[PDB]
A paper describes a structure:
Bacteriophages use bacterial RNAP to transcribe their own genes. Herendeen et al. developed an in vitro system that leads to the current understanding of T4 late transcription. It was found that T4 encoded gp55 enabled RNAP to execute low level (basal) transcription, which was further activated by the sliding clamp gp45 and its coactivator gp33. To initiate basal transcription, bacterial RNAP needs to form holoenzyme with gp55, which recognizes T4 late promoters and confers the ability to form a catalytically competent RNAP-promoter open complex (RPo-gp55). Gp33 and gp45 further activate the basal transcription activity of RNAP–gp55 holoenzyme by forming a catalytically competent transcription activation complex (TAC-gp45).
The structure of gp33 and β flap in TAC-gp45 is superimposable on the crystal structure (neglecting βi9, which does not contribute to gp33–β flap interaction), indicating that gp33 makes a similar set of interactions in both structures. When bound to the β flap, the negatively charged residues E64 and E65 of gp33 are positioned to make electrostatic interactions with the positively charged residues K76, R77, and K79 of the RNAP zinc-binding domain. In our structure, the H3 of gp33 contacts the upstream dsDNA. In addition, gp33 contacts the DNA backbone only, consistent with the observation that the sequences of the upstream dsDNA are not conserved in T4 late promoters. The upstream dsDNA goes through the center of the closed ring of gp45. The cryo-EM structure of TAC-gp45 shows that the HLH motif of gp55 blocks the exit path for the nascent RNA and must be displaced to allow further extension of the RNA and transition into transcription elongation complex.
Author numbering:
A (entry chain D): 253 to 855
B (entry chain C): 2 to 1341
C (entry chain F): 63 to 153
Write the structure that this text describes.
């Protein structure tokens, strides 16, 4: 019996063995009796089936079920499947010096570090603590050390402190998709029970903060600390290996902050005055003497190492908004201002990060990103970007478009029912008319919402981008689809069918107003559909990536230059109509064999 | 007008639609089933009675001795529930049966009974169902979730598509019995028709037919029509009725009477045939050659040869016509043929038949069934025989025969349980028609076919299993009938039936622990239906289709509530009103829509009988007269919806919420949220662990009363009366008399439980809510359970909540809290873990529960008692000892290091060793109670005696009160008899009232009455003594043990886990999250009025998760609280009642026309105050699911408060006191505490045990297990050049035993350096392949 | 109960009948049918008792090991291995 804790297993091998050996002796014994050869044949058969069932059960007619209606395990079953030695214990293997817990944020952290509770911290380093104590003489024997560590003789902590000084840790999530699902950090000790987290990296981990559970391991050898240090530290993993995209995208709320910052009101406090330094900008903001999103002339300067490494600086006067400058005080050296004068949704900050990394190196970039998160969180906080029953504007003419649509469809239906058209094309017409009304009410709402700024400018009024928290997110692109809005305000058209057909009459309602029973029922069905598909999709993706990783599994850069001038002539792709990848991309970062000419010959 | 216990806190209810039908009693399913399982009634038709009158009577092997059954009775609960809960015994009863053995006079059946010999026989111990529809198996409380399966009968499967990819559609038909063996008929890609049995190999159905003793000519007769020839002078004028000539081309001029009607090479129209019937043609010209393909009908003999000129099914040829027609049998028969009207598929099956007779047919039957055996005719005979017509191995339940003749459209509901040759032929005919193109298939999940089981049904099934076993046995027993030396018991083994029953309950995947941490989940875990286990698909056999929703699910199964993950729709739940048809089918209440009235009459309708009708949706008005005030109304007939006439419709729904399960009927503003979010909402709602206090949610759904009263944890009076003695431990009501029975005027005594363990370690207790002296009516709430409140369900706490970003501390889903709630500890929860230590006897001698333990610091020992049982209140932690229990040593386990001391001290030293019950590392807490169990007649120690004396003193108390209350009426009547005739003033009271028959009253019949009622007094005294000492015996006594043990002790740790950064909280709207940080009060955003706000959610939540419901809830809740600050203020400053009631009535007006219509001028003005103080905390609001509260009423009430109608207001930072531009939204929202607590999740492992077959560090958290390090991670590591990491990872920290030891040393002595080594479990594989002869090796 | 056992059972019974055919009077016991019948019957019961108490022995060995790694033991199961290991031992 294994008896290794828990329920006990039966290690049923012997049983077969037992019964197997049994028959063997019987055979001899019966041969020893000069048995009627018919039955000696029978016993030979029993023996053969026995050794069979020992080697690989099931390959015959009736696999010998163990008991409780279960097949038992041969020598082969220990080998195959996702539980045989290979896929169970040769490759995947539970390991010591490890821990697991729930996760939280802790935004005070900078990039290269992770929170870590006191307790797990204590166990994960017990050997280190012992070594340190007995080097210090504070204990004398290992047993002394065990006792000291037991009841936390208050020295211990500082001991542990010394041990952590730069000792890395390695963090991971459960479904490890790619090269960044597991990284390194340098922890800071918490008198808590959960794990903080530098709120940027959470994208790589594809991780919500709704009860995820992270795992943590610890390198032992100095070599191991080094490996982790240079090669799996967050300060080393910023460009998604799938594509040279910076993978540190400030995700959603920093986004809302920044967007709310870089923007302009039609006429705010002290708009359009003149200033001479973003210091003054800060002051006039906090002093409450100047609003934030307001046009203003300000003197600034900027740099560039366009010359031979030398970031020559030079001034000018611009007309911008305050927060533009306020942020601008942070933008590091080698950047021109026009990078910032825009209203700064999300992809803007993305490409800004990228060019910064490209021209500047690495450390400027990380310091930059950190400061960015700080500022964004802060200013979003100051904003008060709430949302309520008034954030959802409504198309007044919704009922209009809908009433006319249904009026027509009644007509075309009584036309068919009078026997004037075919049912299939009548259905098609209904499809198309509901699509028409759909898009029309979409335009109605979206437009009405997106522009309702009407505020005098010492004169009559002007109409610029409005400020609906909803709309503010959307135009920010921080979170939410335009179609999400569409559903909120516009009727969310028509849904699917268990087949994939579509119901004749659409969902006429919004979420502002309440759904009636039937529409809601239908939506229910569709959602259940999508969920089951989520399950199956994860499933199949599993075995797919399995085969994929398995097929290469061995390709390694062995050399430098295979000594050849061939390859393939890449070109932009044209789907016949519009082109999709500019030639700039297929080439970017792919060593060319031949040189290139100009369209002009010999060039 | 309301329940006088409703008047205690009346919640306002928006909502415009009235109701015609109440919610029914929810748990009614289990109740009705199990009731129906044990019910002595005529014909039984079900339950025990059924199996009994089936298997019995029964007799010898024609040995002229019979065993007959008569009647039965269920014995008794020897104890009651809580008793079993204490011990751990199955709440059950025995079954007393009436039987008789009757042997027969010699050589005559009717020959007199050799002996009428009957007896009462003991058999089985069936469990029993509590009044809450649960079970008690071993102390614990399991539940039997009901199944749902494919009803028995016959079904017409399509299997479109992938059959052969040819584009053609195959077909099949399947008969399924309740019990027995199925049967299948189906096609080949070549229009060949075949039978299949037990899903085994395929055989030609012709073989079955042969088995039916069927001349192939009779087969041909069955299927095809007839065609008649007569040999003419020439050209073979065939008989014709013109119809069958619809759809044929004229290869010859269709003519009669000479006048041709069709030209050579003309495809005849239908109208031709019409005018031809008008011509009434019967005989027609035929080119004999055209008759080449018409196969013969059947055989044909000759006369001179007297020999078969043709055998049945011979291919017709011209010379063959010569032979035939020559013999003058002018009557010729062949078969009708067609392709798109009558496909001739039987003929070819006949062709392929290798068989000749019924007998070789049976031979084939055997061969296909049991392979390779050289058959005996009789073998196959018996096989097929009992295969399909003997009750031993086949049955259709009544529902079977019903569905069978139904799908066959026949007109009988009754029949047999077994088949008939007809039936099979009828199947085949129907399927053939389907194949031609007349007839439609069925689909799987159409609820018109899926029937539903229950507890009683499967109960009696297992019962039948056991009964059949004992049948075999006792039959062979009566076989050796020793005449008259046998009562009808001696043959009877009553063990195995009880064995099977106990198995079923204690072991069946249709049985699990009652999910027990909420009056909600306790009720969700009964109104739940699945299709898993015996008779259902498999969790990874799951087909897509079943896992979806069928429009027929309307009001029969919750569309939205099912536990997501690896299974959806399989563990779906049941809706509100949905009943169960007697056949295990579903029905639904429905109102009649007569000429112009949607009347108040209602019925219950199936999933198919429904299809004939159009039925009105809910949210559409009528003119108080059934006339839809509109004209084109939203309705539905069959998988459809449309606008319908004012008079097309037939029925209407009963109430909106009849679409969903109760686990959603609460989450308010539902029609403002997506389904997905609604799903997560209901599920995460099902797990709201009950916290310390209990406050109601302010915004409800108007449907939380019928949850509690139908749940169990409540305590409810059984008849009105007066509260007479409350106490935090028990309740004593004096019943009122008109609600009282003659004997035992009596007092309802409710013994609320105090803190006891829930099945997942959460406290429970039934605290009272009543005032001493107050009256209650017949059926009011008396004491409240976990997360309950005065009959109101209350699963979480409602909190002032704000919506805004804040320093990322609500970045992803971080919920951010102030100290001030944990200051109030309003989210604390206790926990209860039962620990147990037993005393069995191994070899080497039994064991002790002494306080005498070796090699342990006496410091610890002190904490125990003299017995060895630590005291009540000792705050304990892990790595300690709670009981001392010691064992003899044994030999093979003796180390020299003690061989020394046993040598020296004399072997009286190392004879024993510790087994003490420790404190499970990782726990702390406080002891609450200790149970100690011992064999009776075996010595009982101090603690045992203490529990004894306590419990008996207690149990005496109530009955003491009983007698002293019920008796005094006797002295009432006594002095009433002494009053008339010189009543005495101070003799009757200053002296003992017993001292009344010692004073001489003028001795007439009144002193006779004195002595009479005195004897009656003393008799009632003594029989009260009888009762109480019966109780004393029962309680004082010990308790039997599963022999092999001596005595056992159970201890009840407890812990109050409060809250911490890491826990999981969420609102009913699937908006979950972990509380990240808890700052000081000073930093929470505060309003101008000083009051800070508890929690600050995130704004981003709504766009992605389009669930508006949260925001609308919050606004409404701010409104609802906005009545508090009104009433509370108006009241604190003192106030007369006039204005109070005035403002009350006003606030209750507040809306469009609803059903509420309450009035307060009713009250006697004090209960007014009571109500007001109930309100003082805030005003409770009700809003049904789809009869909600539109925005306008919300704006209104908001104004009736004092608030800005937006709901948004301005707020200030608490760290700069400055204003927040862009005013934000705060309100009051119900938050729940999800029971995934961090302290249950955190777990480390420096180093610990290892598995032994392979030395990999063990897994799981109970074991000190190391994390799972996977192949994906392996790759993610190889992507980097992370070599040493991966190596030292997977060897030095996992398996390299030598290596890991060397490491451990070097690290604990200051040397980070690795020795590679080589894995161990690898060697395990190496030897494992060395097992088989595949010699493996490791070259140089 | 169990196909696997049943195989060995029948094996036993067959050998038993084989050897026991050696001695079968004819003048008495005019039937060999029941002879072989009860012969195999006894062979079967022998085999089954052997196997029953073997797996019983397994249970017995098991229940004498509760000292595996740390705290947090179980009470429910152990009693059942115990109670079987007792019932079988009753015989
Ligand atoms: Mg997650």
């Amino acid at each position: 019996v294994p008896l290794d804790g828990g329920r006990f297993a039966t290690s049923d091998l012997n049983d077969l063995y037992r019964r197997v050996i049994n028959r063997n002796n019987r055979l001899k014994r019966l041969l020893d009796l000069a048995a009627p050869d018919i039955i000696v044949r029978n016993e030979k058969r029993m023996l053969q089936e026995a050794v069979d069932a020992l080697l690989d059960n099931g390959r015959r007619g009736r696999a010998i079920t163990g008991s409780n209606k279960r097949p038992l395990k041969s020598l082969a079953d220990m080998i195959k499947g996702k539980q045989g030695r290979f896929r169970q214990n040769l490759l995947g293997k539970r390991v010591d010096y490890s821990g697991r817990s729930v996760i939280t944020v802790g935004p005070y952290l900078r990039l290269h570090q992770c929170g870590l509770p006191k307790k797990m911290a204590l166990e994960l380093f017990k050997p280190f603590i012992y070594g340190k104590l007995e080097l210090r003489g504070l204990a004398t024997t290992i047993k002394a050390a065990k006792k000291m560590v037991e009841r936390e003789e208050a020295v211990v902590w500082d001991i542990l402190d010394e041990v952590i000084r730069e000792h890395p840790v390695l963090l991971n999530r459960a479904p490890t998709l790619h090269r960044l699902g597991i990284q390194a950090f340098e922890p800071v000790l918490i008198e808590g029970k959960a794990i903080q987290l530098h709120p940027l990296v959470c994208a790589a981990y594809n991780a919500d903060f709704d009860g995820d559970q992270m795992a943590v391991h610890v390198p032992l050898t100095l070599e191991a600390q080094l490996e982790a240090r240079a090669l799996m530290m967050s300060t080393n993993n910023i460009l998604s290996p799938a594509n040279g995209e910076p993978i540190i995208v400030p995700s959603q709320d920093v986004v809302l902050g920044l967007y709310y910052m870089t923007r302009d009101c039609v006429n705010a406090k002290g708009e359009g005055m003149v200033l001479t330094g973003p210091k003054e900008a800060e002051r006039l903001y906090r002093s409450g003497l100047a609003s934030l999103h307001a046009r203003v002339k300000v003197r600034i300067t900027e740099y560039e190492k366009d010359a031979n490494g030398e970031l020559v600086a030079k001034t000018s006067l611009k007309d911008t908004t305050v927060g533009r400058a306020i942020l601008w005080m942070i933008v590091p050296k080698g950047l021109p201002y026009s990078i910032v004068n825009q209203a700064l949704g999300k992809k803007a900050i993305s490409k800004m990060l990228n060019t910064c990394y490209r021209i500047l190196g690495l450390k400027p970039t990380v310091i930059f990103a950190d400061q960015i998160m700080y500022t964004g969180f802060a200013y979003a906080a100051r904003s008060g970007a709430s949302v309520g029953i008034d954030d959802m504007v409504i198309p007044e003419k919704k009922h209009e478009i809908i009433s006319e649509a249904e009026a027509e469809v009644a007509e075309i239906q009584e036309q068919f029912q009078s026997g004037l058209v075919t049912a299939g094309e009548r259905y098609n017409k209904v499809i198309d008319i509901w699509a028409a009304a759909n898009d029309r009410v979409s335009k109605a709402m979206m437009d009405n919402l997106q522009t309702e700024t009407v505020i005098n400018r010492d004169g009559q009024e002007e109409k610029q981008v409005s400020f609906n928290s909803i709309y503010m997110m959307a135009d920010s692109g921080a979170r939410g689809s335009a179609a999400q809005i569409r559903q909120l305000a516009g009727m969310r058209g028509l849904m699917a069918k268990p087949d994939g057909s579509i119901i004749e009459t659409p969902i006429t309602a919004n979420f502002r107003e309440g759904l009636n029973v039937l529409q809601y029922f239908i939506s229910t069905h569709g959602a259940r559909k999508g969920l089951a598909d989520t399950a199956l999709k994860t499933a199949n993706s599993g075995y797919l990536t399995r085969r994929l990783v398995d097929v290469a599994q061995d390709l390694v850069v062995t050399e430098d230059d295979c000594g050849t001038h061939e390859g393939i002539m890449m070109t932009p792709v044209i789907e016949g109509g519009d082109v999709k990848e500019p030639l700039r991309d297929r080439v970017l970062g792919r060593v060319t064999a031949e040189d290139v000419l100009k369209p002009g010959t010999a060039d | 007008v309301y329940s006088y216990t409703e008047k205690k806190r009346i919640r306002k209810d928006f909502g415009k639609r009235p109701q015609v039908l109440d919610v029914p009693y929810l748990l009614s399913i289990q109740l009705d089933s199990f009731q129906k399982f044990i019910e002595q009634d005529p014909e039984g038709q079900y339950g025990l009675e059924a199996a009994f009158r089936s298997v019995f009577p029964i007799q010898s092997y024609s040995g002229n001795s019979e065993l007959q059954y008569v009647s039965y009775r269920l014995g008794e609960p020897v104890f009651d529930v809580q008793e079993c809960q204490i011990r751990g015994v199955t709440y059950s009863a025995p079954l007393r049966v009436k039987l008789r053995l009757v042997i027969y006079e010699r050589e005559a059946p009717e020959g007199t009974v050799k002996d009428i010999k009957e007896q009462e026989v003991y058999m089985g111990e069936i469990p029993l169902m509590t009044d809450n529809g649960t079970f008690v198996i071993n102390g614990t409380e399991r539940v039997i979730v009901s199944q749902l399966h494919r009803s028995p009968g016959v079904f017409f499967d399509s299997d479109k598509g992938k059959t052969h990819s040819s584009g053609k559609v195959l077909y099949n038909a399947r008969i399924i019995p309740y019990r027995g063996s199925w049967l299948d008929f189906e096609f080949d890609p070549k229009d060949n028709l075949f039978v299949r049995i037990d899903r085994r190999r395929k055989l030609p159905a012709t073989i079955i037919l042969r088995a039916l003793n069927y001349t192939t000519e009779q087969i041909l007769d069955l299927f095809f029509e007839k065609v008649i020839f007569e040999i003419r002078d020439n050209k073979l004028q065939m008989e014709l009725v013109p119809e069958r000539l619809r759809g044929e081309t004229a290869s010859f001029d269709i003519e009669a009477n000479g006048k041709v009607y069709v030209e050579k090479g003309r495809r005849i129209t239908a109208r031709h045939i019409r005018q031809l019937e008008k011509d009434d043609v019967k005989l027609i010209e035929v080119p004999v050659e055209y008759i080449a393909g018409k196969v013969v009908a059947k055989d044909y003999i000759d006369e001179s040869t007297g020999e078969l000129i043709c055998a049945a099914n011979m291919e017709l040829s011209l010379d063959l016509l010569a032979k035939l027609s020559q013999s003058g049998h002018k009557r010729i028969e062949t078969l009708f043929t067609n392709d798109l009207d009558h496909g001739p598929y039987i003929s070819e099956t006949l062709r392929v038949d290798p068989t000749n007779d019924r007998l070789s047919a049976l031979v084939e039957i055997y061969r296909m069934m049991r392979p390779g055996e050289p058959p005996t005719r009789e073998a196959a005979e018996s096989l097929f025989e009992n295969l399909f017509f003997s009750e031993d191995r086949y049955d259709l339940s009544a529902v079977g025969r019903m569905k069978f003749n139904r799908s066959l459209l026949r007109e009988e509901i009754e029949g047999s349980g077994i088949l008939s040759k007809d039936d099979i032929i009828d199947v085949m005919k129907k399927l053939i028609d389907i194949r031609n193109g007349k007839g439609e298939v069925d689909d799987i999940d159409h609820l018109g076919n899926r029937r539903i089981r229950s507890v009683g049904e499967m109960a009696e099934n297992q019962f039948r299993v056991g009964l059949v076993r004992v049948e075999r046995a006792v039959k062979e027993r009566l076989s050796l009938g020793d005449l008259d030396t046998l009562m009808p018991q001696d043959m009877i083994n009553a063990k195995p039936i009880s064995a099977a029953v106990k198995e079923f309950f204690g072991s069946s995947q249709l049985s699990q622990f009652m999910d027990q941490n909420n009056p909600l989940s306790e009720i969700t875990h009964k109104r739940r239906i699945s299709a898993l286990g015996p008779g259902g698909l498999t969790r990874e056999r799951a087909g897509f289709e079943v896992r979806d929703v069928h429009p027929t699910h309307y009001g029969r199964v919750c569309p939205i509530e099912t536990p997501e993950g690896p299974n959806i729709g399989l563990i779906n739940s049941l809706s509100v009103y949905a009943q169960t048809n007697e056949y295990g089918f579903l029905e639904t209440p429905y109102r009649k829509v007569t000429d112009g009235v949607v009347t108040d009459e209602i019925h219950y309708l199936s999933a198919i009988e429904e299809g004939n009708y159009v039925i009105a949706q809910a949210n559409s008005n009528l003119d108080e007269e059934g006339h839809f005030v509109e004209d084109l109304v939203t309705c539905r007939s069959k998988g459809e919806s449309s606008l319908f006439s004012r008079d097309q419709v037939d029925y209407m729904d009963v109430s909106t919420q009849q679409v969903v399960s109760v686990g959603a009927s609460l989450i308010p503003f539902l029609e403002h949220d997506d389904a997905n979010r609604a799903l997560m909402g209901a599920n995460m709602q099902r797990q709201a662990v009950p916290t310390l206090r209990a406050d109601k949610p302010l915004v409800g759904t108007g449907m939380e009363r019928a949850v509690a009263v139908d749940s169990g944890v409540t305590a409810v009076a059984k008849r009105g009366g007066v509260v007479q003695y409350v106490d935090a431990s028990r309740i004593v009501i004096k019943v009122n008399e008109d609600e009282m029975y003659p004997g035992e005027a009596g007092i309802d005594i409710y013994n609320l439980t105090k803190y006891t363990r829930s099945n997942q370690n959460t406290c429970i207790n039934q605290m009272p809510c009543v005032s001493l002296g107050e009256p209650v009516e017949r059926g009011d709430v008396l004491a409240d359970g976990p997360s309950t409140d005065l009959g109101e369900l209350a699963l979480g706490q409602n909190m002032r909540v704000a919506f805004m970003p804040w320093n990322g501390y609500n970045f992803e889903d971080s919920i951010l809290v102030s100290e001030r709630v944990v200051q109030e500890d309003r989210f604390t929860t206790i926990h209860i873990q039962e620990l147990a230590c037993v005393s069995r006897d191994t070899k080497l001698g039994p064991e002790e529960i002494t306080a005498d333990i070796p090699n342990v610091g006496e410091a610890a020992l002190s904490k125990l008692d003299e017995s060895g049982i630590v005291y009540i209140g000792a705050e304990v932690t892990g790595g300690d000892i709670l009981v001392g229990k010691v064992t003899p040593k044994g030999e093979t386990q003796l180390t020299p290091e003690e061989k020394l001391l046993r040598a020296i001290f004399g072997e009286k030293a190392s004879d024993v060793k510790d087994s003490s019950l420790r404190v499970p590392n990782g726990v702390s807490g406080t002891v609450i109670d200790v149970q100690v169990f011992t064999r009776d007649g075996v010595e009982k120690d101090k603690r045992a005696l203490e529990i004894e004396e306590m419990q008996l003193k207690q149990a005496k108390k109530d009955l003491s009160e009983e007698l002293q209350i019920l008796e005094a009426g006797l002295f009432s009547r006594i002095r009433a008899v002494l009053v008339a005739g010189g009543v005495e003033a101070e003799k009757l009271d200053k002296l003992p009232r017993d001292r009344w028959l010692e004073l001489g009253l003028t001795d007439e019949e009144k002193q006779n009455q004195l002595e009479q009622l005195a004897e009656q007094y003393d008799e009632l005294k003594h029989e009260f003594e009888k009762k109480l000492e019966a109780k004393r015996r029962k309680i004082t006594q010990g308790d039997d043990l599963a022999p092999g043990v001596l005595k056992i002790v159970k201890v009840y740790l407890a812990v109050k886990r409060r809250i911490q950064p890491g826990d999981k909280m969420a609102g009913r709207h699937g908006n979950k999250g972990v509380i990240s940080k808890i700052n000081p009060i000073e930093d929470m955003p505060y309003d101008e009025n000083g009051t800070p706000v508890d929690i600050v959610l995130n704004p981003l939540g709504v766009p992605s998760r389009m669930n508006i419901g949260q925001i609308l809830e919050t606004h409404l809740g701010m409104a609802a609280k906005g009545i508090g600050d009104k009433i509370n203020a108006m009241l604190k400053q003192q106030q007369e009642v006039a204005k109070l009631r005035e403002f009350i009535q006003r606030a209750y007006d507040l809306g469009a026309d609803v059903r509420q219509k309450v009035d307060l001028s009713t009250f006697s003005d004090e209960e007014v105050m009571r109500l007001a103080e109930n309100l003082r905390k805030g005003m409770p609001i009700a809003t049904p699911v789809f009869d909600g509260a539109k925005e306008a009423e919300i704006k209104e009430l908001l104004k009736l408060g004092d608030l800005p109608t937006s709901g948004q207001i301005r707020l200030y930072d608490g760290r700069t006191g400055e204003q927040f531009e862009r005013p934000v939204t705060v309100g009051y929202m119900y938050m729940l505490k999800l029971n995934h607590l961090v302290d249950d999740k955190m777990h480390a492992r420096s180093t610990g045990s290892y598995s032994l077959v392979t030395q990999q560090p063990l897994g799981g958290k109970a074991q000190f297990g190391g994390q799972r390090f996977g192949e994906m991670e392996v790759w993610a590591l190889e992507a980097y050049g992370a070599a040493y990491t991966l190596q030292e990872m997977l060897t030095v920290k996992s398996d390299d035993v030598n290596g890991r030891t060397k490491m451990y040393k070097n690290i604990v002595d200051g040397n980070h350096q690795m020795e590679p080594g080589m894995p161990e479990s690898f060697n395990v594989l190496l030897k494992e392949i060395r097992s088989l002869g595949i010699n493996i090796e490791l070259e140089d | 109960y169990t196909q696997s056992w049943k195989q060995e059972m029948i094996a036993d019974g067959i050998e038993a009948s084989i050897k026991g055919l050696h001695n079968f009077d004819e003048t008495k016991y005019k039937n060999p049918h029941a002879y072989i019948t009860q012969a195999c019957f006894n062979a079967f019961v022998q085999r089954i008792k052997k196997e029953r108490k073997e797996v019983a022995k397994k249970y017995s060995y098991f229940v004498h090991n509760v000292y595996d790694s740390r705290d947090d033991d179980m009470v429910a199961l152990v009693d059942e291995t115990f109670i079987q290991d007792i019932y079988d031992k009753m015989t």
